[PDB]
Design a protein around this ligand. Structure first.
Ligand code: ATP
Ligand code: ATP
Ligand code: ATP
Ligand code: ATP
Ligand code: ADP
Lengths: 544, 528, 44, 217
């Protein structure tokens, strides 16, 4: 019948006690039970849900084989799936990994006794891959997150109790909009074999009546403590996710409302996360667009230890996202064979993670509109039309005109700077361009020369800026930006200082950066009559 | 108080002096009562503990109940006292004192001492002298406490302890004699206390042979200059996360446990280094700044640097030794780019005084004038605490905003600096201030030159031999190369004056492009 | 140039001293089961 | 009714292909109409089988901006009341804010629950819901720019962010917004997933003016 899977590899048994008034408190050893099970009942065929009467030292039991593994001789590792179907059967052996779990009645005081075996309810599901989450890019951050957070919960309890340590109980994700920081929380909530998350949108806790807000924020932990006092360590993980933390928990001390509510909720959360009592079985997720307004005390270790930053993806991530999003199309044969994802990933320079889906939407909209022709030529719907729908490359090309980046707004200036065209009426231009390319090479290859500055000068009207843009554009660097008088016009002086300062602070993220400054002289307000000019800006540039 | 006790036996490290001071609280109640009334002294009733977040206070509050005999202090967190109903919150405060009150009124002075502790006191006891004109419950509550706290009606067996992170918020009406008398500040641990914190945290680690003998705690303590106790157990757990993750391969594959290697699990020093790499204190001073200034490093290409360094050693010895020299200021000047800041940084780092700071335009970037004034004053004020202090001022001319057209500059900062440079520190402190500049004539001309005790010139290098020294140190080329280049330069342009920084820049550029003479020599010749 | 909120205090604390409304609520239940038993006897 | 083996259009269709642009009565603006009906409503005419066979959710946002007195309200109204859907939940500009400490935010939350409940109950066959915000630019300002000693300028925006696209999905709502000035609306509301299609409405050209005269008389 089975062919090959003829042995019982690993057997998980719910050991109910026979008679519940007899309930024996003396501790039960899984090793003795396994040895007795093998010794008495050998070379028998067992199937899932077979019930058995075990008389061990006069103490009867109702074993139910909750699950069975069927393995063929010659399998070094038990890669065969543990099958819950009654069809799978095996022949018991002296090598059977017999796991006992307490019965449905839970009455049996089973022990792990040097059983280097997975936990009763190891949350993270032993066979699990990052590729199943469905998130493209960010292949490094998951390593950090899981290593620091969940690595300690799987490992057998005795040795961690030796390691005399407490699990971390906080996790923060922060970044600019649309980078994908909500997807992670959701799938972590849904894929981990824990209790259901207790979702709270950010400012849900405020309430009319005095003393009801704080009540609401301490009504979340009730089940966790309730379970912890009873079952101690073997409680299952509880997870509660705060969405968009930064609404309510401001730095206490400002004058936010005029009532004094934010301070109280801050106080309650602070006192409860660490407090006097120990919980040791709880985990909280935070999310935000600014890390700077959260009150300082929250960030101390013991509360919200690990902080992770989510930033825009690179090209490889872009390719991965196009893979994920356009997954089902390909297998459903709804897509032309002409589109190749690589060039798409090439074109979308500064697209965030959240823009690609809109691109998919628009391309689909073009294809589908091609059929219906809403309005004038109505009622053309028929089976033939819809029976051969496929998206085409030109639909994507058309779609690029609707969706536009949000961060890639300044390079547009650079490409329009050379609308007048470029002409090689002289040898000189070629030499200059070559020299600039040489310097670009030097900066790209070097390690210790982390800063280089150039100056380009000559008669007015000589066509300087276009050449600079031409140098910049061919580099292919991730990060490009331009500062010109057109941007700063109309601002107040302090605002100018702040803007320049922020641009330089925003140029310290990516490994490779190119920055262009246009017409310093007009930036510093030079007029020869006085002369007069604004000194502070001059200083700011000089120092920077 | 229990006789089965000594202060060693509990985990609080470093805070020993504070323990002695706070104990020195319970002394009055050790004796039989009869003495004290004959000595006409009342007992202290109010206590305040306070410090920055993550100093360990909650551990003391939790653990103290063991030492302090009888039964248990009651515990409450701030925002649970408030309540829905009118007069319920008012009631709640004046319900706590009932037990002790009762026992006292019955038994007189035999009363067992009662302790109650408000964790996170600041939640509700804001200044009653405040406004906002919402519902006045936030006033009534505090009134109640004061009534039960001051006019206790001879209830002389109660000690209230207040725990906070931020003292200033609290009503001034609680901080007077007879009500919260003593306020104890708990600040960051010393290096010894840091060692004891390692000791207690790594106690259990050390017994059951989980830690490799390679580890040596003293150096770890030496490295971690700026950490809270909280940070320390954070580091411990980061290290363990590294150590554990070598068997279990998270993500990749399934859970592959080498059941054999589980018995051999052991942390190692490199794990600790990575753990250090992960955590970062909010301590914030990050004086590693000094080392990044001197990251280019020192090669001692000539005797002049050596003489200058010995002179610096002479001055640091001088300020360290004499008691009548409590303030010394020096100036360092030379041509631009000769390299001056690095030399001062070298002297400062070699000094090894407890306290060091540097002021540079970089941090001063972006503020308004008044903010700069404030910052400068604050850093000076800070500098005045430790007995021996080294302070460096970088590129005064840039700080004062000199531009020669007007000439335009900000007078106020200049005046601040001039005044501050002459001010002797408070009693029994000494200070050493090192200022660098590059445009001596201006310093002459506005006429603040009288406030500097001694001046050091640093001429740039000019002789081809020194060029040979630095370039052999840089390993630019092979030996024959380094000879031929200097032989060619001898006749190409013997008269020579560059600096140092530019030489390094040219060396690297030539190394990349064309390490024959035809580039490097060319660039020096154009520069020179 | 100022705005404020306000917080209510619910009061009605005569009721709140007890569960809430138990005057003609919990007593009604008490005597209504008695009505049920007597009617059971009458129908029997 | 039931979907036969033949792929015929949705039983309770929304747009009704016996539909025409000259039924609206808005003269001038012509291409914009094409854009809006292409991008937003097209997805909801095809049989749900294929559209689910594309695994793509419908757009859930619309924004209209322009100078004063150009016809925006007209568009909003007409779209409101010639489709096959429940009655829109109109709201005027500063109508959400309230006195008590937590009544404003609850007022934002009141708006959506009926669509949520209907979506839970049945799923993809739910009738479309419409809610239209009038004159967005009164309350929804850039967070953290206004000093806001009265801290309402943050929480309202925060709620609407959290609830238009949060940890729970919801794909049977269409929200339409109107304004004269987008430059002050928060940036986080104008990313794909929230207010995808933005449309300018400008002054009329001459032929459009002829059209308007034809409409009015
Ligand atoms: N890297 C990514 N991998 C997979 N899906 C992505 C990725 N980036 C974006 N998406 C898709 O687009 C959405 C991106 O926005 P999401 O819903 O995660 O909110 P968010 O970016 O956290 O928004 P905000 O911070 O503005 O509240 C994802 O939910 C998913 O549908
Ligand atoms: N060979 C070329 N080199 C440079 N610019 C060229 C060339 N051929 C055409 N052009 C056009 O001529 C324009 C000249 O304007 P541009 O801003 O570059 O000059 P400029 O001297 O820096 O300007 P300004 O007078 O504003 O200081 C360029 O922007 C470019 O579009
Ligand atoms: N023996 C040395 N003497 C001086 N500088 C040295 C020496 N060895 C290496 N350097 C490097 O030379 C450079 C000179 O110092 P630095 O760059 O601060 O110049 P500076 O003249 O103080 O600056 P500036 O020109 O901005 O006023 C530094 O990078 C320093 O590390
Ligand atoms: N394109 C148009 N076609 C027909 N009528 C129009 C058009 N534009 C405006 N109108 C007429 O103008 C009147 C007012 O238009 P509407 O209320 O939409 O203005 P609005 O753009 O909302 O203005 P505001 O910005 O001041 O609120 C409408 O009743 C309509 O009759
Ligand atoms: N010897 C020690 N010194 C300082 N802190 C310690 C020591 N031992 C443990 N800790 C840690 O100090 C932390 C105390 O936090 P605490 O300062 O009470 O928080 P808060 O300041 O918010 O009340 C705890 O996480 C505790 O584990």
């Amino acid at each position: 019948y089975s062919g090959k899977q003829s042995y019982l590899g690993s057997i998980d048994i719910d050991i109910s006690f026979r008679a519940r008034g007899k309930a024996v408190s003396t501790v039960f050893d899984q090793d003795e039970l396994a040895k007795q099970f093998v010794r008495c009942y050998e070379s028998q065929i067992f199937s899932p849900t077979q019930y058995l009467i075990m008389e061990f030292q006069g103490h009867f039991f109702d074993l139910k084989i909750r699950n069975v593994q069927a393995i063929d001789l010659g399998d070094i590792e038990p890669t065969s799936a543990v099958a819950t179907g009654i069809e799978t059967k095996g022949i018991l052996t002296k090598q059977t990994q017999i796991n006992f779990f307490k019965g449905r009645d839970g009455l049996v005081n089973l022990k792990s006794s040097n059983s280097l075996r997975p936990r009763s309810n190891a949350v993270i599901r032993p066979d699990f891959k990052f590729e199943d989450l469905g998130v493209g890019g960010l292949d490094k951050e998951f390593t950090k997150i899981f290593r620091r957070a969940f690595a300690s919960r799987i490992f057998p309890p005795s040795v961690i109790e030796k390691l005399g340590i407490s699990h971390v109980k906080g996790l923060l994700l922060y970044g600019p909009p649309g980078t994908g920081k909500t997807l992670i929380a959701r799938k972590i909530g849904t894929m981990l074999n824990a209790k259901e998350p207790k979702i709270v949108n950010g400012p849900e806790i405020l309430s009319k009546y005095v003393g009801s807000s704080e009540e609401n924020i301490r009504n979340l932990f009730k089940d966790a403590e309730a379970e912890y006092r009873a079952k101690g360590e073997e409680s299952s993980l509880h997870i509660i996710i705060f969405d968009e933390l930064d609404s309510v928990f401001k730095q206490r001390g400002s004058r936010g409302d005029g009532t004094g509510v934010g301070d109280n909720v801050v106080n309650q959360l602070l006192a409860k996360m660490d407090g006097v009592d120990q919980l040791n079985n709880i985990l909280v997720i935070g999310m935000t667009n600014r890390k700077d307004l959260i009150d300082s005390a929250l960030l101390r270790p013991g509360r919200f230890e690990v902080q992770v930053e989510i930033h825009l993806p690179d090209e490889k991530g872009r390719l991965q996202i196009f893979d994920i999003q356009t997954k089902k199309m390909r297998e459903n044969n709804m897509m032309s064979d002409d589109v190749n994802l690589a060039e798409l990933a090439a074109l979308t320079k500064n697209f965030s993670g959240a823009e690609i889906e809109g691109l998919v939407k628009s391309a689909s909209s073009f294809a589908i509109n091609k059929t219906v022709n809403i309005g004038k030529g109505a009622t053309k719907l028929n089976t033939k039309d819809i029976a051969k729908l496929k998206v085409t490359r030109e639909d994507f090309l058309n779609a690029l005109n609707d969706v536009t980046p949000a961060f890639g707004i300044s390079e547009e200036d650079l490409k329009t700077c050379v609308e007048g065209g470029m002409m090689l009426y002289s040898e000189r231009v070629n030499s200059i361009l070559k020299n600039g390319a040489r310097y670009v090479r030097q900066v790209r290859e070097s390690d210790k020369s982390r800063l280089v500055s150039l100056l380009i000068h000559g008669p007015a009207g000589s066509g300087k800026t276009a050449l600079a843009a031409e140098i910049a554009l061919k580099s292919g660097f991730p990060f490009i930006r331009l500062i010109s008088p057109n941007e700063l016009s109309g601002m107040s002086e302090s605002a100018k200082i702040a803007y320049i300062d922020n641009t330089f602070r925003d140029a310290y993220k990516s490994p490779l950066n190119i920055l262009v400054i246009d017409s310093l002289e007009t930036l510093v307000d030079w007029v020869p009559i006085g002369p007069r000019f604004s000194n502070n800006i001059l200083q700011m540039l000089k120092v920077a | 108080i229990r006789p089965d006790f000594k202060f060693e036996d509990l985990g609080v490290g470093g805070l020993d002096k504070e323990f002695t001071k706070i104990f020195r609280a319970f002394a009055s109640r050790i004796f039989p009562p009869s003495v004290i009334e004959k000595l006409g002294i009342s007992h202290v009733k109010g206590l305040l503990l306070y410090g920055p977040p993550g100093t360990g206070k909650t551990l003391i509050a939790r653990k103290i109940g063991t030492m302090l005999n009888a039964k248990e202090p009651k515990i409450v967190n701030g925002p649970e006292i408030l309540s829905k109903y009118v007069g319920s919150s008012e009631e709640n405060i004046r319900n706590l004192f009932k037990d002790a009150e009762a026992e006292y009124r019955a038994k007189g002075e035999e009363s067992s001492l009662h302790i109650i502790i408000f964790d996170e006191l600041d939640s509700v006891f804001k200044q009653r002298g405040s406004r906002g004109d919402g519902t006045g419950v936030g006033d009534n509550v505090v009134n109640q406490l004061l009534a039960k706290m001051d006019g206790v009606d001879q209830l002389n067996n109660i000690l209230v302890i207040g725990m906070t992170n931020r003292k200033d918020l609290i009503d001034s009406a609680l901080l007077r004699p007879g009500r919260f008398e003593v306020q104890v500040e708990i600040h960051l641990p010393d290096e010894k206390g840091r060692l004891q914190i390692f000791d207690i945290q790594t106690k259990k680690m050390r017994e059951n042979n989980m830690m490799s003998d390679d580890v040596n705690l003293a150096e770890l303590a030496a490295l971690t200059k700026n950490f809270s106790g909280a940070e320390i157990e954070g580091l411990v757990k980061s290290a363990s996360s590294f150590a554990i993750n070598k068997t279990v391969n998270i993500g990749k594959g399934a859970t592959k446990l080498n059941t054999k290697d589980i018995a051999k699990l052991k942390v190692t020093r490199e794990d600790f280094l990575n753990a250090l790499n992960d955590v970062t204190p909010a301590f914030g001073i990050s004086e590693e700044d000094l080392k990044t200034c001197v990251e280019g490093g020192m090669m001692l290409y000539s005797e002049r640097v050596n003489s200058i360094l010995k002179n610096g050693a002479r001055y640091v010895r001088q300020v360290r030794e004499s008691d009548k020299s409590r303030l010394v200021s020096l100036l360092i000047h030379g041509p631009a780019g000769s390299g001056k800041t690095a030399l001062a940084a070298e002297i400062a780092l070699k000094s090894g005084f407890p306290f060091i700071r540097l002021i540079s335009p970089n941090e001063l970037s972006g503020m308004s004038e008044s903010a700069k004034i404030a910052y400068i004053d604050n850093t000076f004020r800070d500098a005045y605490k430790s007995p021996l202090n080294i302070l460096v001022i970088d590129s005064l001319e840039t700080l004062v905003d000199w531009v020669p057209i007007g000439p335009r500059f900000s007078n106020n900062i200049l005046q601040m600096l001039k005044v501050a440079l002459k001010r002797k520190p408070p009693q029994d402190r000494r200070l050493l201030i090192m200022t660098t500049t590059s445009a001596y004539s201006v310093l002459q001309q506005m006429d603040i030159l009288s406030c500097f005790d001694n001046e050091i010139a640093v001429p740039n290098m000019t002789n081809l031999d020194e060029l040979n020294n630095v370039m052999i140190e840089s390993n630019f080329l092979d030996d024959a190369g380094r000879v031929k280049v200097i032989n060619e330069l001898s006749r190409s342009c013997p008269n020579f004056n560059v600096g140092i920084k530019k030489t390094l820049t040219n060396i690297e550029t030539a190394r990349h492009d064309e390490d024959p003479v035809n580039e490097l020599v060319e660039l020096m010749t154009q520069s020179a | 140039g100022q705005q404020i909120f306000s917080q209510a205090l619910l009061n009605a604390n005569r009721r709140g001293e007890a569960k809430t409304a138990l005057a003609e609520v919990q007593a009604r239940h008490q005597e209504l089961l008695k009505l049920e038993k007597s009617m059971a006897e009458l129908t029997q």
